[PDB]
Design a protein around this ligand. Structure first.
Ligand SMILES: *[C@@H]1O[C@H](CO)[C@@H](O)[C@H](O)[C@H]1NC(C)=O
Ligand SMILES: *[C@@H]1O[C@H](CO)[C@@H](O)[C@H](O)[C@H]1NC(C)=O
Ligand SMILES: *[C@@H]1O[C@H](CO)[C@@H](O)[C@H](O)[C@H]1NC(C)=O
Ligand SMILES: *[C@@H]1O[C@H](CO)[C@@H](O)[C@H](O)[C@H]1NC(C)=O
Ligand SMILES: *[C@@H]1O[C@H](CO)[C@@H](O)[C@H](O)[C@H]1NC(C)=O
Length: 464
């Protein structure tokens, strides 16, 4: 009601005039009145603008367009009330904040509140000719602006105008920040390093993601340094970003070695890729026979001497030798895996149809720039005992000496059996054990070797 003409529960503050919004001609005075015995201030607020006035009556003599907005009366008891003031200007139907930014999946408010609400259709429209995309929603408000609903990444760098019944707006360029909808994609330049005390350790973690906000870090795993990374980053467009953080150690020392992990994280989720590094101070090699180093073969059969082994640096010399003489003729060689981390090899020596003669000791040799290493396979072959030598050192004692495999046992016969006078025999031959037995012959009246394989004989004769 109009206020008495005075000639001359705790309540919220009263305002005059008692209206919600008030249209006011440009250049005309804005006269607002607040009645509250415990009044404090009137706050005015268009867009980000803010202003205070500690006088119960707000008076602006020559209203401008900018003067359009929310007028809130507030009392000491914490309580308030507001009224909105539209200052219609035939010229300016929009005061604006061109700065438009939205976040994918959240709403956005275009800031073009109008200074005149006596208009018929508050809608959203085109840009430089063209109209709008479909699926796009907007719930407009004369007091706030127009709120584009549930922005899509697709709307990036879009341009648009404020619609109402038609009105000329000003130029806006939409900018959509993206939502993380996928863990970061992280990679390393090389998953593994075999190093030599003294050289330079280097690596580049590569992280690709949709926003400069991705969190990435290197992690010397048992944690001492955070020893600086050398960052650098690119932006391949709008939602494509990649950053490289190269890790380096000028002088690689044994102690260094461990797993360096590249961690990446974003509000969606996290991802890590690991690279292990081992630094050695001596070129090395160690072998691995794949069968007993001792081997037995039957007369006509075959064998494969196999052996794997670990070498770093890569080998540059390797052979098989039988009698102080190497091969060219019956052996294989090959990397175990053809990765980049392969330090491991394998060689086979294919002995075939080997006659009882091929018995002996076989050696495999291999070396790199720093070390040489080798191991020996003792190959015993089964063969018929050969009578090395028949002797007659005389107490009349007759001797007989043979070799073969397995060890050859010597039985004697007169013409029953004699006894023995001997025993073992330590060198070459290799892969053949030698037997030595003797008899006395001092008993009158007118030499057999054998083992699990064969039996040979030599013969003596004498007379009483
Ligand atoms: C936007 O806000 C809603 C809640 O209103 C939230 O759940 C949604 O995730 C937000 N959008 C994004 C992708 O941050
Ligand atoms: C990864 O991001 C999530 C989401 O904000 C956060 O809770 C967490 O602290 C982050 N962890 C790391 C390793 O930065
Ligand atoms: C690293 O990733 C592996 C493989 O997905 C996962 O099992 C582990 O939880 C991750 N570690 C950290 C600390 O994020
Ligand atoms: C075969 O090698 C094993 C050890 O790996 C050993 O115990 C054995 O003596 C060898 N074979 C024979 C019959 O000697
Ligand atoms: C190669 O790296 C190691 C060494 O050979 C092996 O264990 C692994 O299976 C291989 N991985 C790749 C790159 O396929």
């Amino acid at each position: 009601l109009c206020v008495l003409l005075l000639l001359l529960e705790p309540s919220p503050p009263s305002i005059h005039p008692g209206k919600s919004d008030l249209i006011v001609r440009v250049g005309d005075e804005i006269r607002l009145l607040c009645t509250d015995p415990g009044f404090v201030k009137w706050t005015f607020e268009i867009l980000d603008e803010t202003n205070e006035n500690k006088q119960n009556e707000w008076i602006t003599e020559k209203a401008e367009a900018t003067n359009t907005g929310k007028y809130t009366c507030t009392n000491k008891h914490g309580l308030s009330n507001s009224i909105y003031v539209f200052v219609r200007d035939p010229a300016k139907l929009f005061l604006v904040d061109r700065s438009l930014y939205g976040k994918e999946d959240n709403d956005t408010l275009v800031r073009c509140p109008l200074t005149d609400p006596e208009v018929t259709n508050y809608s959203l429209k085109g840009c430089q000719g063209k109209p709008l995309p479909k699926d796009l929603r907007f719930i407009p408000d004369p007091k706030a602006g127009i709120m584009i609903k549930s922005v899509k990444r697709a709307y990036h760098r879009l341009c648009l105008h404020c619609s109402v019944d038609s009105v000329l707006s000003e130029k806006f360029i939409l900018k959509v920040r993206p939502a993380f909808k996928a863990v970061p994609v992280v990679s390393v330049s090389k998953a593994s390093y075999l190093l030599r005390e003294g050289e330079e350790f280097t690596v580049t973690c590569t992280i690709k993601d949709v926003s400069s906000s991705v969190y990435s870090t290197w992690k010397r795993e048992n944690s001492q340094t955070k020893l600086q990374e050398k960052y650098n980053s690119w932006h391949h467009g709008d939602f494509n970003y990649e950053r490289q953080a190269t890790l380096t150690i000028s002088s690689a020392r044994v102690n260094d070695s461990g797993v360096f992990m590249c961690y990446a994280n974003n509000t969606f989720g996290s991802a890590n890729v690991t690279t292990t590094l081992e630094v050695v101070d001596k070129g090395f090699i160690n072998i691995f026979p794949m069968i007993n180093t001792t081997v037995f073969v039957n007369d006509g059969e075959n064998v494969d001497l196999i052996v794997e082994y670990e070498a770093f640096p890569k080998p540059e010399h390797q052979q098989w030798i039988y009698m102080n003489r190497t091969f060219t003729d019956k052996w294989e060689d090959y990397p175990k895996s053809e990765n980049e981390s392969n330090i491991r090899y394998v060689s086979e020596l294919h002995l075939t149809r080997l006659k009882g003669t091929e018995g002996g000791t076989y050696t495999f040799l291999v070396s790199n720039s720093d070390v040489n290493a080798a191991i020996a396979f003792n190959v015993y072959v089964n063969t018929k005992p050969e009578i090395l030598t028949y002797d007659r050192l005389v107490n009349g004692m007759l001797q007989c000496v043979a070799a073969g495999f397995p060890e050859p046992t010597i039985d004697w016969y007169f013409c029953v059996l004699p006894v023995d006078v001997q025993t073992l025999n330590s060198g070459p031959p290799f892969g053949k054990l030698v037997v030595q037995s003797s008899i006395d012959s001092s008993a009158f009246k007118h030499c057999k070797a054998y083992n699990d394989v064969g039996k040979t004989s030599a013969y003596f004769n004498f007379a009483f």
